[PDB]
């Protein structure tokens, strides 16, 4: 039924675009004026909220992936249940990344005067906070899921042999590069963005 709706929305978009284009009014579907006239606080607050939301839905994702297999693998070998908690920690740090980026973004969130409200800088710092919240929340989502998967494999290879956890912790390190790189990119994107003035 979802494929029927995906086809129906596509057919309605094609029929509306071709009807609007054939009648000489095709510039009325104006995405640029939509970007110019929507409020920058929508993009800013939506970016902050999706940053701290999608970091947590990746952190909590990885936490259950390498938590349920840690508890399952700890039934026969209970000497992993404290040492291997660093796999919970590596997928938990992607939430503090999104938190400390969301607070730094919300510091740039003041009341702009209505005479200069849809200005160049106010609209720039809405766009920048939106996409720099998206590129941090999604990167921490994907990093949390990857660290959870490579910690769920580590929690079972630890219970197999003790000398394997040191060898497969390296894969968790290379997986946890990603959230820190998103942490860097989201600070470079909203680095030149000013407050709302």
């Amino acid at each position: 039924f979802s494929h029927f709706l995906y086809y129906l929305v596509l057919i309605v978009v094609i029929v509306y675009g071709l009807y609007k284009l054939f009648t000489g009014h095709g510039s009325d579907i104006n995405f640029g004026k939509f970007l110019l006239r929507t409020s920058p606080y929508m993009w800013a607050n939506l970016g902050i909220a999706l940053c701290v939301g999608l970091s947590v839905v990746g952190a909590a994702w990885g936490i259950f992936i390498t938590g349920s297999s840690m508890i399952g693998a700890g039934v026969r070998a209970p000497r992993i249940t404290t040492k291997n908690l660093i796999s919970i920690i590596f997928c938990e740090v992607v939430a503090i990344y999104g938190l400390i980026i969301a607070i730094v973004f919300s510091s740039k969130l003041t009341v702009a005067t209505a005479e200069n409200m849809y200005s160049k800088s106010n609209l720039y710092t809405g766009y920048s906070l939106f996409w720099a919240g998206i590129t941090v929340g999604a990167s921490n989502l994907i990093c949390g899921i990857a660290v959870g998967i490579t910690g769920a494999t580590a929690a079972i290879s630890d219970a197999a042999d003790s000398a394997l956890f040191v060898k497969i912790l390296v894969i968790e390190i290379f997986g946890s590069i990603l959230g820190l790189l998103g942490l860097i990119v989201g600070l470079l994107m909203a680095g030149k963005a000013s407050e709302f003035q």
Partner: protein
Amino acid sequence: GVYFNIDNGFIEGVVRGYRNGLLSNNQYINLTQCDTLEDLKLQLSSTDYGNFLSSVSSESLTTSLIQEYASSKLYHEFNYIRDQSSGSTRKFMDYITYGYMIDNVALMITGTIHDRDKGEILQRCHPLGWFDTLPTLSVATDLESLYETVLVDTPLAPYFKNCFDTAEELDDMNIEIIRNKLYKAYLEDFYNFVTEEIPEPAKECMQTLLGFEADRRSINIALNSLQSSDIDPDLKSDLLPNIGKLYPLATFHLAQAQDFEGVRAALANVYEYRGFLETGNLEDHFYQLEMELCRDAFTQQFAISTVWAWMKSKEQEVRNITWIAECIAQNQRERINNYISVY
């Protein structure tokens, strides 16, 4: 591997823990050095079997009681893993036990033709293939009054689709036909279940583990039909499963295989089963290939095929322990190293 650990997180990690109790080659060599069944019990007590024969105490300890209790703890571990299963996993666990239900049906309705007592033909039945109307197969002789009375409410009921009851009640010749045909329809249904609802990493490595069951059953049907069967190939082709690696070209030549060479030249064209019928024990070839296919099903992580690969490996472990304890109790040690160890 992103949606696996929702319902299957605890289930895999315990089965992965059950995998680490598989006896290695050194733990088998330490069992072949034993002199007494008591020494073999004490050697198994240092493994993850520890104190499973504790209520025996060195006097009533036979080589069949070891095979009883070592498989009984396999069955209780399987029931513990099945009780924590839900959804598609629990249905996958039920589909494993259906193949043991078929063997218990075919073992229960041969104990009534020979008029053996119902209390002793059920202790030989398999505990995982238990359904609630299994003792009540001792009520009728013909196939129709055992289907329409007992086997309709069983989950073996869709598998009676080609068993043609010509009002001949039962000899020992057609119960094997009913057994092979139920197992044929079951292999079809469980392959379609694996292809349909089981996710993709546990799909490709389970279709191979199940097509191997189909190929082994095809070769065993087409090779046991030489000695104790005189049947037509059009009636023999209803016994061979059509899911495997061996079906579309080679089970045709196994259907019209009237001689041993009709089997051997049919299995020479398939690439991974050639050389099985040349040298050595054929049953050991199939068990070795089963363990080599179950070994590389543990190497894929987020898969529910690890349950199948665990319980078949643990059954081979119980068979190897039973073979060793049969060797060290009857004082024959010429083939004590005929066990199969890939772990």
